[PDB]
């Protein structure tokens, strides 16, 4: 159930009864990294760890941007207006806010595909909504904390 539109929204592939006559459905179509290489690598020491020699273990996390592509469908007698409000709500600020390092990038073309379901032309609409957000992970890695160098002049 989205805050922008006043209707009920549900997940893509469930096994429940159709909720009401007007409602929505969101599916995840794909996602991918956006740039070829990383932005930074964040190193952080694990809280209260030990690698066997009095050294706290080090965890590294890459940071790259990613793109997620969803598939939005609205079923019933108000699909076009409900998706038009979503398209026009992507421009105003303080409204299109998402919690963590997430950004709505673009809302795509909106098509209408009425379908003859259950002895009645069921109005339908569908679009694509794409987000944009950084990447988080963490893997344990090893670090240098000393050096050694030897210098010689071959022939004095």
């Amino acid at each position: 159930m989205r805050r922008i539109t006043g209707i009920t929204v549900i997940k893509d592939h469930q096994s429940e009864d159709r909720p009401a006559l007007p409602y929505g459905v969101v599916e995840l179509a794909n996602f991918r990294d956006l740039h070829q290489q990383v932005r930074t690598i964040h190193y952080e020491d694990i809280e209260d760890s030990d690698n066997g020699e009095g050294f706290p273990e080090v965890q590294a996390t890459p940071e790259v941007e990613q793109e997620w592509v969803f598939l939005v469908q609205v079923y019933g007698p108000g699909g076009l207006d409900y998706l038009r409000k979503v398209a026009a709500a992507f421009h105003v600020n303080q409204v299109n806010d998402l919690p963590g390092s997430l950004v709505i990038h673009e809302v795509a073309q909106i098509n209408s595909i009425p379908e003859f379901l259950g002895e009645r032309w069921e109005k339908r609409a569908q679009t694509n909504i794409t987000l944009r957000g950084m990447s988080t992970d963490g893997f344990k890695v090893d670090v240098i904390e000393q050096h050694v160098i030897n210098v010689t002049g071959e022939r004095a």
């Binding site: 932005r39 930074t40 940071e63 941007e65 600020n93 299109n96 963590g100 390092s101 997430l102 950004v103 990038h105 944009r132 957000g133 950084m134």
Partner: protein, 142 residues
Amino acid sequence: MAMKAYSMLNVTATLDGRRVIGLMDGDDAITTSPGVDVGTMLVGADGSWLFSQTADKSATVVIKLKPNSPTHRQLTEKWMAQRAGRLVGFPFDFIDSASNEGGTGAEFFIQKAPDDSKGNNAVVREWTIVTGEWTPTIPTLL
């Protein structure tokens, strides 16, 4: 305060108090370029070298606007004000909220003017402004 994804919804530009709203489509709608090269290396006939650093801290900015944008009205009023004889600064400054990257200037001046093309669809209107000093802001959030 994680370094969020880039978005045009967090970039803010101010031109003499009022904001800039109507911008054309494209990967380059507000572009600032420095005046001249930072320096010049001179290598002599023997192999020695000498670097020379310039004192020219100036920049130009190019803004692309739709034919229907209040910033276009503001700029076309400022152009006529300059043509009449009045000459003032109208500071311009722009920044990105995600990384504090951008810059500011104190006194700009209209340097170029767009071409009024009507045709069958909408066309860009490009304005070129020039400053005598341009201070970038250091991106502190990387």
